[PDB]
Ligand binder design. Structure first.
Ligand SMILES: [Ca+2]
Ligand SMILES: [Ca+2]
Ligand SMILES: [Ca+2]
Ligand SMILES: [Ca+2]
Lengths: 23, 143
Protein backbone atom coordinates (compact mmCIF):
# COMPACT_ATOMS: atom_id res chain seq x y z
CA UNK A 1 0.00 0.00 0.00
CA UNK A 2 0.83 3.72 -0.25
CA UNK A 3 2.76 2.67 -3.31
CA UNK A 4 0.31 4.44 -5.63
CA UNK A 5 2.27 7.68 -5.90
CA UNK A 6 5.52 5.75 -6.29
CA UNK A 7 3.90 3.66 -9.02
CA UNK A 8 2.53 6.81 -10.67
CA UNK A 9 5.91 8.62 -10.65
CA UNK A 10 7.58 5.55 -12.12
CA UNK A 11 4.74 5.24 -14.63
CA UNK A 12 4.77 8.90 -15.64
CA UNK A 13 8.55 9.02 -16.01
CA UNK A 14 8.48 6.11 -18.38
CA UNK A 15 5.44 7.69 -20.01
CA UNK A 16 7.24 11.00 -20.66
CA UNK A 17 10.21 8.93 -21.90
CA UNK A 18 7.93 6.79 -24.07
CA UNK A 19 6.25 10.02 -25.24
CA UNK A 20 9.50 11.43 -26.69
CA UNK A 21 10.25 8.13 -28.50
CA UNK A 22 6.73 8.10 -30.04
CA UNK A 23 6.91 11.56 -31.63
CA UNK B 1 -9.63 -6.24 -8.16
CA UNK B 2 -9.03 -5.54 -4.50
CA UNK B 3 -10.24 -2.57 -2.46
CA UNK B 4 -6.49 -2.31 -1.82
CA UNK B 5 -5.73 -1.61 -5.50
CA UNK B 6 -8.58 0.84 -5.75
CA UNK B 7 -6.85 2.57 -2.85
CA UNK B 8 -3.63 2.66 -4.81
CA UNK B 9 -5.29 3.91 -7.97
CA UNK B 10 -6.79 6.82 -6.00
CA UNK B 11 -3.40 7.83 -4.50
CA UNK B 12 -1.81 7.57 -7.92
CA UNK B 13 -4.47 9.87 -9.53
CA UNK B 14 -4.23 12.34 -6.66
CA UNK B 15 -0.51 12.83 -7.37
CA UNK B 16 -1.57 14.57 -10.58
CA UNK B 17 -5.07 15.85 -9.72
CA UNK B 18 -3.78 18.58 -7.38
CA UNK B 19 -7.02 20.59 -7.15
CA UNK B 20 -9.07 17.36 -7.09
CA UNK B 21 -11.61 18.53 -9.66
CA UNK B 22 -11.35 15.00 -11.01
CA UNK B 23 -9.37 15.69 -14.17
CA UNK B 24 -5.65 15.96 -14.96
CA UNK B 25 -4.63 19.01 -16.95
CA UNK B 26 -1.36 19.65 -18.84
CA UNK B 27 -0.55 22.15 -16.04
CA UNK B 28 -0.90 19.46 -13.36
CA UNK B 29 1.11 17.05 -15.44
CA UNK B 30 3.77 19.69 -15.98
CA UNK B 31 3.82 20.39 -12.26
CA UNK B 32 4.36 16.72 -11.36
CA UNK B 33 7.10 16.42 -13.99
CA UNK B 34 8.94 19.46 -12.74
CA UNK B 35 8.96 18.07 -9.21
CA UNK B 36 10.41 14.86 -10.68
CA UNK B 37 13.32 16.80 -12.17
CA UNK B 38 12.07 17.03 -15.74
CA UNK B 39 11.02 20.09 -17.79
CA UNK B 40 8.58 18.94 -20.54
CA UNK B 41 7.47 21.36 -23.21
CA UNK B 42 3.78 22.29 -23.58
CA UNK B 43 3.64 20.04 -26.76
CA UNK B 44 4.99 17.07 -24.79
CA UNK B 45 2.36 17.48 -22.09
CA UNK B 46 -0.30 17.62 -24.77
CA UNK B 47 1.18 14.50 -26.36
CA UNK B 48 1.29 12.59 -23.11
CA UNK B 49 -2.40 13.37 -22.53
CA UNK B 50 -3.51 12.75 -26.10
CA UNK B 51 -2.07 9.24 -26.12
CA UNK B 52 -4.69 8.41 -23.44
CA UNK B 53 -7.51 10.99 -23.88
CA UNK B 54 -10.20 8.65 -25.26
CA UNK B 55 -12.89 11.35 -25.42
CA UNK B 56 -10.54 13.93 -26.92
CA UNK B 57 -11.47 16.67 -24.38
CA UNK B 58 -7.83 17.61 -23.68
CA UNK B 59 -7.80 16.31 -20.10
CA UNK B 60 -7.50 12.92 -18.37
CA UNK B 61 -10.22 11.42 -16.14
CA UNK B 62 -10.06 8.43 -13.79
CA UNK B 63 -10.65 5.57 -16.22
CA UNK B 64 -8.35 7.21 -18.81
CA UNK B 65 -5.77 7.40 -16.05
CA UNK B 66 -6.34 3.69 -15.35
CA UNK B 67 -5.23 3.07 -18.90
CA UNK B 68 -2.01 4.96 -18.16
CA UNK B 69 -1.37 2.78 -15.10
CA UNK B 70 -2.19 -0.37 -17.10
CA UNK B 71 0.39 0.05 -19.88
CA UNK B 72 3.39 -2.18 -19.11
CA UNK B 73 6.81 -1.13 -17.78
CA UNK B 74 7.15 -3.72 -19.19
CA UNK B 75 12.89 -4.37 -21.25
CA UNK B 76 14.07 -0.97 -19.97
CA UNK B 77 12.53 -1.02 -16.47
CA UNK B 78 15.51 -2.77 -14.84
CA UNK B 79 17.61 0.37 -15.44
CA UNK B 80 14.69 2.63 -14.37
CA UNK B 81 14.31 0.57 -11.22
CA UNK B 82 18.10 0.60 -10.57
CA UNK B 83 17.93 4.46 -10.88
CA UNK B 84 14.89 4.56 -8.56
CA UNK B 85 16.78 2.56 -5.98
CA UNK B 86 19.50 5.27 -6.03
CA UNK B 87 17.12 8.11 -5.33
CA UNK B 88 15.44 6.18 -2.48
CA UNK B 89 18.79 5.07 -1.01
CA UNK B 90 20.06 8.60 -0.27
CA UNK B 91 23.15 7.65 1.73
CA UNK B 92 23.85 4.90 -0.79
CA UNK B 93 24.70 2.22 1.81
CA UNK B 94 22.55 -0.21 -0.29
CA UNK B 95 19.60 -0.27 2.17
CA UNK B 96 16.48 1.85 2.16
CA UNK B 97 15.53 2.88 5.72
CA UNK B 98 12.17 4.05 7.05
CA UNK B 99 13.66 7.57 7.26
CA UNK B 100 14.77 7.49 3.57
CA UNK B 101 11.36 6.07 2.53
CA UNK B 102 9.69 8.91 4.44
CA UNK B 103 11.69 11.50 2.52
CA UNK B 104 10.59 10.00 -0.84
CA UNK B 105 6.92 10.00 0.16
CA UNK B 106 7.23 13.60 1.22
CA UNK B 107 8.89 14.53 -2.04
CA UNK B 108 6.01 12.75 -3.64
CA UNK B 109 3.76 14.90 -1.26
CA UNK B 110 2.77 12.62 1.63
CA UNK B 111 3.44 13.80 5.18
CA UNK B 112 1.70 11.07 7.20
CA UNK B 113 1.87 8.61 8.89
CA UNK B 114 4.92 7.06 10.60
CA UNK B 115 3.19 3.72 11.33
CA UNK B 116 2.37 3.60 7.62
CA UNK B 117 5.98 4.26 6.67
CA UNK B 118 7.02 1.34 8.89
CA UNK B 119 4.19 -0.71 7.45
CA UNK B 120 5.56 -0.08 3.95
CA UNK B 121 9.02 -1.14 5.08
CA UNK B 122 7.66 -4.16 6.82
CA UNK B 123 5.82 -5.38 3.73
CA UNK B 124 8.79 -5.00 1.37
CA UNK B 125 11.16 -6.53 3.92
CA UNK B 126 11.77 -10.21 2.99
CA UNK B 127 14.89 -10.98 5.08
CA UNK B 128 13.58 -9.24 8.24
CA UNK B 129 16.47 -6.83 8.83
CA UNK B 130 14.10 -3.85 9.05
CA UNK B 131 15.19 -2.20 5.81
CA UNK B 132 14.82 -2.63 2.03
CA UNK B 133 17.85 -3.87 -0.01
CA UNK B 134 18.05 -3.72 -3.83
CA UNK B 135 16.41 -7.09 -4.53
CA UNK B 136 13.63 -6.42 -2.01
CA UNK B 137 13.05 -3.14 -3.72
CA UNK B 138 12.98 -4.74 -7.17
CA UNK B 139 10.09 -6.91 -5.96
CA UNK B 140 8.32 -4.05 -4.18
CA UNK B 141 8.25 -2.25 -7.54
CA UNK B 142 7.27 -5.23 -9.68
CA UNK B 143 4.28 -5.88 -7.36
CA1 LIG C 1 -7.35 18.73 -11.66
CA1 LIG D 1 -10.48 13.01 -21.46
CA1 LIG E 1 20.40 3.89 2.80
CA1 LIG F 1 15.42 -6.37 4.25
Amino acid sequence: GHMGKIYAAMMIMDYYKQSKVKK
Amino acid sequence: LTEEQIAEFKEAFSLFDKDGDGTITTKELGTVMRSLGQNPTEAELQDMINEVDADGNGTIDFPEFLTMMARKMKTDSEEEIREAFRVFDKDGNGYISAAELRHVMTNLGEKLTDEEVDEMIREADIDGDGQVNYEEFVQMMTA
